[PDB]
Design an enzyme around this catalytic site. Structure first.
Site, short mmCIF file in Angstrom:
data_model
loop_
_atom_site.label_atom_id
_atom_site.label_comp_id
_atom_site.label_asym_id
_atom_site.label_seq_id
_atom_site.Cartn_x
_atom_site.Cartn_y
_atom_site.Cartn_z
N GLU A 1 0.82 -1.20 0.00
CA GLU A 1 0.00 0.00 0.00
C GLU A 1 0.86 1.26 0.00
O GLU A 1 0.69 2.16 0.82
CB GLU A 1 -0.96 0.00 1.18
N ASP A 2 1.81 1.30 -0.93
CA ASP A 2 2.69 2.44 -1.19
C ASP A 2 3.74 2.67 -0.12
O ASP A 2 4.41 3.70 -0.14
CB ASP A 2 1.90 3.74 -1.40
N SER A 3 3.90 1.75 0.83
CA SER A 3 5.01 1.88 1.76
C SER A 3 6.31 1.47 1.08
O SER A 3 6.34 1.12 -0.10
CB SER A 3 4.76 1.03 3.00
#
Ligand SMILES: [Mg+2]
Ligand SMILES: [Zn+2]
Ligand SMILES: [Zn+2]
Ligand SMILES: [Zn+2]
Lengths: 147, 67, 45, 113, 89, 49, 263, 113, 84
Positions: free
Chosen positions: A1-3
């Site tokens: 999730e875009d981490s």
RNA sequence: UGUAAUCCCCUUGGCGGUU
């Protein structure tokens, strides 16, 4: 999730490390024919309504010196404004409040090293100071990066 | 600003090879050959010397604040 | 009582909280405070 | 333990409503607690808290989680709950609200969990 | 030995009544803002400034990182005019 | 001499392009603080319409 | 039962092959060499004067990364385990740097050769910054022009790379096993043919390629490991390997002592 | 701000035991071992050493969270063998393996010096 | 007048989730204010857990008053409402 | 025995971040 996952050892070796500067300004205002503000280290006796921070880092002229580590709510500029004295001259041994504090505290969430202090005169001929604070920000969980 | 002491990825010391790298480039060697001559095999190390921009030579041009 | 440094000629001097804010020798209007005499220590990390 | 050591407390409130600040008290060890007083203790593990993201389009945008105290400065979520919140970890921020009563704590743990 | 008790139940004199104390039962840090050095523990040899001096647990901000830590009094070396002095300042 | 000086300085300082007493109905945002976060941001700001 | 075979040997890197050991033991050895072998590095900087264009903490970070000779660091003690008030000679090494530019023209380079050892443990070969040769100037620390001076006093302590990467003796440990993929531990992505699209491993000639008619062997385990240990110069390659083994032994012995004292 | 101290990865507090053992009563002759201030380096070594013993029927480990430096190991032996004895045998065997490895490396280095 | 007799009560005989939550909260608050506990406590210390234990055993001494739209109401004891 | 301090605008405009 875009981490993303970053290498801690690369961070230790200086990857994406940066430098942060913040400047504070203050000047002596003129309210009348002889009502002026003064840069000074206010005392608990002659001034009233002092800030809850510490004034022990100020020099004789009411300005902090470069190279001094500062924390949140510390006073970096000491300024007082005159106040008409009360009837305390009744029995006070010169220990009556004649000035009110107008000091500039460091921001509560910030801390660093005093980097450079500038003292000069404004267009009106009054004193005028600028204090620059320096700190280093190392990447950590939550910092935003982008390609 | 100035050549980093250690390579970020692995940790090889590349801070002592900036002057030698510039000397090699002065003699007409290509960048790849210059990096090979300094024994920089991994490309993680090669990017440190290859993509470094030397900004301290621009900061030093300002007159010192004290004397 | 406290040292100062001029912004152009880098000349050290001192002020007594009553002199005009000015360099004594070149008349510059911008001066800087000098570094503190306290000990400065860093963690080298 | 005081207001700087975890687990700790910030205030002690007497029956009459007076607040005792533990930062400015020199005799914190000389305080005896009577039944019915309140201690404004720190947030601890398994405390129900309401958690929210804007814009709150539907009622699944506010749900009550259980607290787990962790280092570093970000809120942390199991990734399955990123769908009802419409949240991802590219910079989003979320709001946390602490209940202040037994009744409100029960409501959060029994309705919005 | 006189105590002035007031109760909302009592109406006489707006609940104010005088009762002797014998007849009732119950129901400046000189090291503050001074440079200090740590001699033991995980912060040996780090310069700091004392911020809180409640007792036996001193809060010292560190110059090296940007943080403040608690520390017992026995672990401190308070700076003086002649070198470093242990906790006898 | 204060008229032109104060008018120009006010309009450039606040961004309201007009007289000081007609701040309402004047075109606002004409003058903005230069963005100095990085060199590219400054270059982009200087070429904006 | 375990065997070691050295391929290349140098002061700074050794290329060796381990055999008859489990994969876990080799990986634990690699991890220990990377992040658990104690070395000596600058940990406190007292800046008495710094008029250079670099920030004080910039130079402090640069100094911390300079490798120092850590040959006799075993005799040295940890800072937190030394009962001495402040720092003594048995738990710290004091280095001092003083740089200045004379004349009104030119630029002076400050190198790590200018770091002078002032005090340290008696007769222990520790603290001196690592130099490639006798004429190697070392790591570039700063640059100065006229009337700019750098005067600092640095203190070096003993630590491990878990706490900070500046105490790591190794740079990069190449690690490799099973060049020909007989164990089928990896599945090769391809477009047309997986054999001709993937480069051969540098140790492919050290093992016989599988026969065309050979069947898969489900009883086989990884047995030979090829690893190269590169160091930063603070410790020699053999010293790094031996001290990693010793550190692993000490850790296991501590666990054993805890178990035996638990009852 | 909330970043923990780096020495907490390996420095053991006085009140925290290095090694806590609790039995697992769900299956016979099984124990759960909690190692403090340790990581995959010791855990994987011990696990793969113990997996080869004929009298050890189950051995596993897990690191609950990367931000906390500890791991928990589950061991379960045959009826004859107490699990703690198996753990001690594993530790001693790995120590002997490392000792002979060091000796052989020293011999080879001296030969090729 | 407004009260509805026990024989003619027509609301649901089950404890709704809102009533359950409110009853648990009120009982937990009362216990935290040193009210007598009507069940034996083994080792529990949380007021909410004690309230849940009381509810499971039908020992909560509270009455639900359900307000009909016209203003009349039905009084149900928490000991006679079925809880899931 | 000399005993340490508690407080902060408003309006406006712009620039941004997450959708
Ligand atoms: Mg997003
Ligand atoms: Zn590299
Ligand atoms: Zn001048
Ligand atoms: Zn010592």
């Amino acid at each position: 999730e875009d981490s993303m996952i970053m290498n801690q050892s690369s961070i230790d070796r200086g990857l994406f490390r940066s430098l942060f500067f913040r400047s504070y300004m203050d000047q002596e205002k003129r309210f009348g024919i002889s009502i002026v503000e003064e840069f000074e280290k206010p005392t608990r006796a002659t001034t009233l309504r002092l800030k809850h921070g510490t004034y022990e880092k100020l020099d004789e002229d009411g300005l902090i010196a470069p190279g001094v580590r500062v924390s949140g709510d510390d006073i970096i500029i000491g300024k007082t404004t005159p106040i008409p004295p009360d009837t305390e001259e009744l029995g006070q041994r010169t220990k009556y409040h004649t000035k009110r504090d107008a000091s500039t505290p460091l921001r509560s969430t910030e801390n660093g090293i005093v980097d450079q202090v500038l003292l000069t005169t404004n267009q009106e001929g009054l004193k005028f100071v600028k204090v620059r604070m320096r700190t280093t920000k190392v990447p950590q969980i939550g910092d935003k990066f982008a390609s | 600003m100035i050549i980093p002491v250690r390579c970020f990825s692995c940790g090889k010391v590349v801070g002592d090879k900036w002057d030698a790298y510039l000397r090699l480039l002065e003699e007409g060697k290509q960048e790849g050959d210059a990096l090979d001559e300094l024994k920089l095999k991994r490309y993680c190390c090669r990017r440190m010397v290859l993509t470094h921009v030397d900004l301290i030579e621009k900061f030093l041009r300002y007159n010192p604040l004290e004397k | 009582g406290v040292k100062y440094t001029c912004g152009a000629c880098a000349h050290n001097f001192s002020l007594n909280k009553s002199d005009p804010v000015r360099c004594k020798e070149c008349g510059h209007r911008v001066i800087y405070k000098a570094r503190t005499k306290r000990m400065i220590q860093f963690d080298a990390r | 333990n005081g207001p700087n050591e975890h687990p700790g407390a910030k205030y002690v409130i007497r029956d009459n409503g007076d607040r005792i600040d533990l930062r400015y008290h020199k005799r914190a060890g000389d305080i005896v607690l009577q039944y019915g007083w309140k201690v404004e203790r720190h947030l601890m593990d398994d405390d129900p808290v309401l958690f929210n993201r804007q814009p709150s389009l539907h009622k699944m945008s506010m749900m009550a989680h259980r607290v787990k105290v962790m280092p570093y400065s970000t809120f942390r979520l199991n990734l399955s709950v990123t769908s009802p919140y419409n949240a991802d970890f590219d910079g989003d921020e979320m709001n946390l609200h602490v209940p202040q009563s037994e009744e409100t704590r029960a409501e959060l743990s029994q309705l919005c969990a | 030995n006189f105590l002035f008790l007031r109760s909302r139940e009592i109406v006489e004199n707006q609940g104010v009544f005088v009762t002797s104390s014998n007849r009732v039962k119950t129901i400046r840090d000189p090291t503050l803002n001074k440079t200090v050095k740590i001699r033991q523990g995980g912060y040996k040899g780090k310069i700091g400034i004392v911020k809180e001096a409640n007792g036996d647990r001193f809060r010292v901000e560190l110059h090296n990182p940007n943080k403040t830590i608690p520390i017992p009094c026995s672990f401190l070396l308070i700076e003086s005019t002649h070198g470093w002095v242990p906790y006898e300042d | 001499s204060t008229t032109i000086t104060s008018g120009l300085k006010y309009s450039l300082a606040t961004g309201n392009w007009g007289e000081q007493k007609k701040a309402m109905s004047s075109r606002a945002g004409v003058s903005q603080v230069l963005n100095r976060y990085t060199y590219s941001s400054t270059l982009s700001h200087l070429r904006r319409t | 039962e375990p065997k070691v075979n050295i391929i290349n040997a140098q002061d700074d890197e050794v290329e060796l092959m381990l055999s008859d050991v489990n994969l876990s033991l080799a990986n634990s050895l690699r991890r220990t060499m990377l992040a658990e072998v104690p070395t000596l590095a600058i940990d406190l900087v007292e800046i008495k004067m710094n008029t250079s264009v670099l920030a004080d903490e910039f130079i402090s970070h640069r100094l911390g990364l300079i490798p120092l000779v850590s040959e006799d660091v075993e005799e040295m003690k940890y800072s937190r385990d030394c009962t001495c008030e402040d720092y003594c000679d048995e738990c710290s090494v004091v280095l001092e740097l003083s740089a200045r530019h004379e004349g009104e023209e030119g630029t002076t380079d400050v190198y790590s050769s200018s770091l002078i050892k002032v005090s340290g443990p008696g007769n222990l070969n520790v603290g001196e910054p690592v130099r490639r040769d006798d004429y190697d100037q070392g790591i570039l620390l700063c640059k100065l022009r006229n009337h700019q001076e750098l005067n600092i006093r640095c203190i070096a302590k003993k630590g491990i790379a878990k706490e900070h990467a500046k105490w790591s003796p190794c740079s990069a440990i190449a690690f490799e096993y099973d060049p020909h993929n007989k164990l089928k531990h990896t599945d090769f992505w391809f477009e047309v043919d997986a054999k001709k699209e993937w480069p051969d491993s540098k140790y492919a000639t050290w093992e016989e390629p599988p026969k065309p008619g050979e069947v898969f062997d489900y009883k086989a385990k990884p047995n030979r490991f090829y690893m190269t240990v590169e160091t930063t110069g603070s410790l020699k390659a053999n010293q790094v390997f031996s001290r990693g083994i010793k550190t692993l032994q000490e850790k296991l012995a501590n666990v054993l002592f805890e178990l035996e004292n638990s009852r | 701000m909330n970043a923990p101290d780096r020495f907490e990865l390996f420095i053991l507090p006085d009140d925290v035991p290095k090694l806590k053992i609790t039995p697992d009563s769900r299956v016979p002759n099984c124990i759960i071992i909690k190692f403090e201030r340790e990581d995959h380096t010791l855990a994987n070594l011990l696990r793969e050493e113990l997996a080869l013993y004929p009298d050890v029927t189950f051995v596993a480990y897990k690191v609950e969270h990367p931000l906390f430096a500890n791991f928990v190991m589950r061991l379960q032996t045959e009826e004859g063998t107490r699990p703690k004895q198996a753990l001690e045998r594993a530790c001693a065997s790995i120590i002997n393996k490392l000792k002979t490895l060091d000796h052989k490396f020293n011999e080879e280095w001296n030969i090729k010096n | 007048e407004l009260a509805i007799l026990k024989e003619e009560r027509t609301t649901t005989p089950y404890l709704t989730k809102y009533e359950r939550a409110r009853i648990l909260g009120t009982r937990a608050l009362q216990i935290s204010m040193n009210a007598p506990v009507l069940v034996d406590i083994e080792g529990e210390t949380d007021p909410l857990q004690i309230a849940m234990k009381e509810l499971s055993q039908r020992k909560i001494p509270l009455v639900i008053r359900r307000y009909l739209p016209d203003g009349s109401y039905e009084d149900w004891g928490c000991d006679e409402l079925i809880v899931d």
